[PDB]
């Protein structure tokens, strides 16, 4: 369990760090800001990042939510 | 993912605290600890946050093998999808069948070889586990009811008819239970029923 | 009506079930109250000892009959109420 | 809260010695659910403290605490005095209530020996009916002198901050 | 599909937890289970999370046939016909409230049948019935409390309180009867008409 | 900063009152007080708000240094990572500060059984394996404090029968004697010191 | 019923996935995005998808909220 | 079923464990009745409570274990 | 007025309905108690047992009358409050 | 001040209103106790039956006065709070 | 804010003060009969309502409160 | 009455809106009506008036059920 | 390696950096400095929004343990 929860935390804490940086480097490099194909692809990465973090937040709140009504009654 | 797959995942993750409180063993675990407290006659010790804290942990050890084995299956026409989905529950359906009363299932199935239906299993399981907890609690009272009557015979043999005994048997009740290592016996035994 | 029977039946059962132990204690008490004059030796705790073994002995012997009666009345009222 | 906690517990003693807490506390309560004397005396002691202007003292200890102690100096309670706290609250209440308990025991002993002379006269009830009068008469006779204790003797003051707390713990 | 039909479809989905609390038999089931807990003298266990859950699942079997008959039906182009068409749908549910309510209450509410008169008349009818069941559940145990008290006074134990030893007797009796299996069956039989 | 490092902050502070109820010594201190009150006869003296207050303060002295140490460990900037597994082990190295505390009081045979049941040491086995030992330790420590009060009741009840004073109720008399005997001897100080000294 | 729930869910999921794909194929085909009459058909498909999935989400969640309410 | 065995044994236990004190308390009452004072009567009563603390322990913990064993398996 | 009558009648019923069972328990205790002063036998269980039988017979015979009285008062007060 | 005065009266009223019912209850208790020691009888329902009448009776006769005391004190304290 | 609260608490006391009598009196009378198991709250509740209805109740306060500022 | 006011209001309004959009769609599909300012000028009025009607009835229905949540949940 | 993974993975807000910014402060400058201000304007609005909540959680957790 815990040895499995530690793996989940670390794997996601790194994937978001790398993904967030990838968006930044695509927006400061000129050949990637002003080309429609590279603009089209950046529109995807931005939205996919937004959804991924929103989902983790929801599912975590529900985890520490079901614990409230069962322990405290 | 898929749009309609989110809606199914989100609704389920909302109803977790009700499913665990009705359909999972947490029902059996939570009651037995409170009956032990009352058999000793303690009013506040340990706190409901303590006991409910344990029942919720010991239950996770028992249920996790089911959720892990289920996740791998979903990660791995209308008639094909429904049949594919059902095989994922078979790992859970089996668990309910093992304990749920054989006749109640048929009785509710008629109100709604036939493989049982979960909606028939849930109420048949909830009601069947409760009965088993009341049964266990009954056995846990008999060793102390002997203690309570025995003490009264001593006071009466000394005539102290208005020396109400309860002060004297309360500490005996504790010596007995810790000399019985009760909290360890119950925790080891209660889990072995599900292994 | 159905209510009066069930309400009246309850009070009757109380006398049937509680009767025997009060008799067994009394019948034993009369022997000690008398024997205190035959032996002409006295300690007031004497009745509390002997009466106890009469009641406990009767309960052990009757523990079976006491159950069948409660299990019949319990079922009967459930059927009457829900029907 | 110390001045209030003392007056409250003072009530719970009187309610038991006079009246009822269930012998086995199976219920467990008896009297009212916070037996009514201990709720009355708790309220009474509070109203007088405000009238003497005590409210300005409560806010005073707050501002001083921030000057003798502040979060970046890691203020911390003193362990040595904290260990004694519970005895002080118990001792203060025990002494103040004493005048009303002693007469209750003496009166029960008065009736107790009478049940040597009139034995089947019931020991218990004739004391239980009576105690609820003797407790009230004797409280009224001392109701006035209890007020001075709340104002000066038990009220906390900003001078105590020097010993209960220490910084960099 | 039309906007006004949809607005009425969204709004009913807001009011669901109230109609099921007043207009449906759920009131009998929820009450009966709590009275069982009180008769045994238990005070926190089983949780209201469980009793309010099991009672809700059992009540679902009884109502499902009524909702499906409205499911299989559209639940036509004129005010009179449209009223008749919409009104004819609710009539599948009207036949339910009227079977479990007293004529005298409805008649008073018909004068200030209509659905609005049936809802409050139905609620009071189910509630009073629940207390009529609870009463019967106390009788088999109160006799046990009196019997325990009666014998101890024979032993001279003026003030050994009963509860420390009578509470287990209540459990064996309820378990030996398989109470939950009898109550959960008899309750649905009043409605399912199996 | 890092978003997953933010979610963990909010989750933790949401769970904190349930962690203190099991994975902390608060469990033992508060329990022992309520049993001693219970045996003294009078009820709600001290008020419940006293007992749960001091037990909460006294416990912070033992746990707060451990918490502070856990955060100061993660703040070192000199660490570097090269793989997912390298991160997991680095995080785990932080919890050893707390684990070592639980390992001391938890009994070996409980943890080993849960560590096997866990399949098909781990903290999730040390929480329930710890909670059960801190409960049990209190019923022992308390039972020895009932002996003197039982003696006091038997003595006075026997005295009453020497005076030949039947059907007086031997509770009015003895309740106040227990308090005077216990309060005049500063029992609450000796009790509180005896608890902290086991862990400090 | 569970026997019917699997049926109601299954049909919903498949019918939606087919529609999403169809629109995508209408955007990559140059003969459709360049033709005004083919665009008018596509505009309707885009809207119809939005309103259906939104209705399922709302009505489902209010069905869950009716259950939550009665249990607390 | 076990419910009947476990229940009958309890009644059998009380008869014996409560029987012994009243018989000996009777005989001792008779002999002393036929035949500092507080100090002596104090030792006399406390004396039998110490002696019986042990023999009762070996019994009850043998019954307590057995009803737990029956209950859980 | 309507307040005094209802408050006064409440105390009246308590005295009447509780009166009968306490008197019979009292009368039985005295007559059985006097016998214990006549005979050389003394036992607490004898009067207690006999009292229960007399009290239960009292509740059985009067059970019906106790019902009408409580319903009449219950009805009257509902009309006084709502009128 | 207007607080200690108002506080004193609350304790004073308790002693006044409950005084007579507790006094009469006390005297009646002693009488039955004396009459018992005069004879060999021993009964415990007897004192309750005699006291029940006396306690209910005195309250009944006094009920009219209690309202006079309370309705004046209630107005008195309300004026001090708002004057 | 602190000033209104202090004064509001004083008003609360005088309104509580008359009902204390009813609780302490009813409790004492029960012990007179030896009904130590009865729970006064079930009996003293109607007495409190009767007193409040016999007084002018909320009409006294609402007028008195406004007159302090009018 | 009260029980039927909902049928009259629901049924009466549904028919009035259903026919109004139908008379709009076919107004934008007649060569004489889509290409004449006198026909476009009226269509600007017609299409906006429908928009306001549904917005008001939708809003007030939500406040109706909102008061029923408030008075019942609290 | 992909990126310099280090201890910057283990904190929510970079309080030592934000403190560095708020000492920079004792009209507009456009568009370069107008862009940088977007960070310092938002990073401080979010930090406060957390602190308001952790105290409410932390007080409430004390009150939960005392109620029982």
Structural class of chain D: mainly alpha
Termini Cα gap of chain D:
25 Å
Helix-strand sequence of chain D: HHHEHHHHE
Largest interface: B-E, 42 and 36 residues
Shape of chain D: elongated
List how many beta strands of chain B DSSP finds.
0
Number of strands of chain D: 2
- The number of distinct helices of chain B, counting runs of at least 4 residues, comes to 8
What strand order characterises the main sheet of chain D? 1-2
Task: Note the quaternary state here.
Answer: part of a larger assembly
Task: Round the Cα radius of gyration of chain B to an integer and report it.
Answer: 23 Å
Q: In angstroms, what is the radius of gyration of chain D? A: 21 Å
Element string of chain B (H = helix, E = strand): HHHHHHHH
Function (chains C, I, J): Involved in a secretory pathway responsible for the surface presentation of determinants needed for the entry of Salmonella species into mammalian cells.
GO biological process, one term (chains C, I, J): protein secretion
Family (chains C, I, J): Belongs to the FliQ/MopD/SpaQ family.
Keywords (chains C, I, J): Cell membrane, Membrane, Transmembrane, Transmembrane helix, Virulence
Q: In short, what is this structure?
A:
The structure is cut from a larger assembly and holds four copies of chain A, four copies of chain B, four copies of chain C and one copy of chain D (169 residues). Chain B is mainly alpha-helical.
Descriptive notes:
This is part of a larger assembly, with 4 copies of chain A, 4 copies of chain B, 4 copies of chain C and 1 copy of chain D (169 residues). Chain A is mostly helical and 73 residues long. Helices cover 93% and strands 0% of the residues of chain A. Chain A contains 3 helices and no strands. In chain A, helix 1 (2-28) runs antiparallel to helix 3 (36-72). Chain B has 195 residues and is an all-alpha fold. Chain B is 82% helix and 0% strand. Chain B has helices spanning 3-22, 26-40, 48-75, 78-99, 102-111, 118-157, 166-179, 182-192. In chain B, helix 5 (102-111) packs across helix 6 (118-157) and helix 6 crosses helix 7 (166-179). In chain C, 89% of the residues lie in helices and 0% in strands. Chain D is built from 7 helices and 2 strands, in the order H-H-H-E-H-H-H-H-E. Chain D has a two-stranded antiparallel sheet. Chain D is elongated and about 75 Å long. Chain D starts with a helix and ends with a strand. Classes of the chains: A mainly alpha (73), B mainly alpha (195), C mainly alpha (83), D mainly alpha (169). Chains B and E meet through helix 1, helix 2, helix 5 and helix 6 of B and helix 3, helix 7 and helix 8 of E. Chain F: The chain crosses the membrane at residues 7-27, 54-74, 141-161, 165-185. Chain F: It is found in: Cell membrane. Chain F: Belongs to the FliP/MopC/SpaP family. Chain F: Pfam families: FliP.
């Amino acid at each position: 369990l815990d040895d499995r929860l530690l793996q989940a935390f670390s794997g996601s804490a790194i994937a978001t760090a790398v993904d967030k940086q990838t968006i930044t480097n695509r927006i400061e490099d000129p050949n990637l800001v002003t080309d429609p194909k590279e603009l089209a692809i950046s529109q995807e990465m931005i939205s996919d990042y937004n959804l991924y973090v929103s989902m983790v937040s929801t599912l975590t709140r529900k985890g520490v939510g079901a614990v409230e009504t069962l322990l405290r009654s | 993912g898929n749009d309609i797959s989110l809606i199914a995942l989100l609704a389920f993750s909302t109803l977790l605290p009700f499913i665990i409180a009705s359909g999972t063993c947490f029902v059996k675990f939570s009651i037995v600890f409170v009956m032990v407290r009352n058999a000793l006659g303690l009013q506040q010790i340990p706190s409901n946050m303590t006991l409910n804290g344990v029942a919720l942990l010991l239950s996770m050890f028992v249920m996790w093998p089911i959720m892990h084995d289920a996740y791998v299956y979903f990660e791995d026409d209308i008639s094909s999808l429904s049949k594919h989905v059902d095989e994922g529950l078979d790992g859970y359906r089996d668990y309910l069948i093992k304990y749920s009363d054989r006749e109640l299932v048929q009785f509710f199935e008629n109100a709604q070889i036939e493989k049982p239906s979960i909606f028939a299993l849930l109420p048949a399981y909830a009601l069947s586990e409760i009965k088993s907890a009341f049964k266990i609690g009954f056995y846990l009272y008999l060793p102390f009811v002997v203690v309570d009557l025995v003490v009264s015979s001593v006071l009466l043999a000394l005539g102290m008819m208005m020396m109400s005994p309860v002060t004297i048997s309360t500490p005996i009740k504790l010596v007995l239970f810790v000399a019985l290592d009760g909290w360890t016996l119950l925790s080891k035994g209660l889990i072995l029923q599900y292994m | 009506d159905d209510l009066v029977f069930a309400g009246n039946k309850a009070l009757y059962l109380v006398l049937i079930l509680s009767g025997w132990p009060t008799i067994v204690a009394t019948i034993i008490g009369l022997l000690v109250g008398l024997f205190q004059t035959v032996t002409q030796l006295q300690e007031q705790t004497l009745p509390f000892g002997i009466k106890l073994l009469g009641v406990c002995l009767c309960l052990f012997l009757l523990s079976g009959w006491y159950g069948e009666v409660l299990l019949s009345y319990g079922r009967q009222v459930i059927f009457l109420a829900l029907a | 809260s110390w001045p209030f906690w003392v007056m409250h517990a003072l009530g719970c003693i009187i309610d038991n010695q006079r009246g009822a807490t269930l012998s086995s506390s199976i219920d467990p309560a008896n009297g009212i659910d916070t037996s009514e004397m201990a709720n009355f005396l708790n309220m009474f002691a509070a109203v007088v403290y405000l009238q003497n202007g005590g409210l300005v003292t409560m806010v005073d200890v707050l501002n001083k605490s921030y000057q003798l102690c502040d979060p970046m100096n890691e203020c911390t309670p003193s362990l040595p005095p904290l260990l004694t706290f519970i005895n002080q609250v118990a001792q203060n209440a025990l002494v103040l209530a004493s005048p009303v308990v002693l007469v209750l025991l003496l009166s029960e002993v008065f009736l107790g020996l009478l049940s040597r002379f009139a034995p089947q006269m019931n020991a218990f009830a004739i004391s239980l009916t009576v105690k609820s009068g003797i407790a009230v008469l004797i409280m009224l006779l001392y109701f006035s002198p209890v007020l001075p204790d709340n104002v000066l003797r038990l009220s906390f003051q900003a001078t105590g901050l020097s010993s209960w707390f220490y910084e960099r713990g």
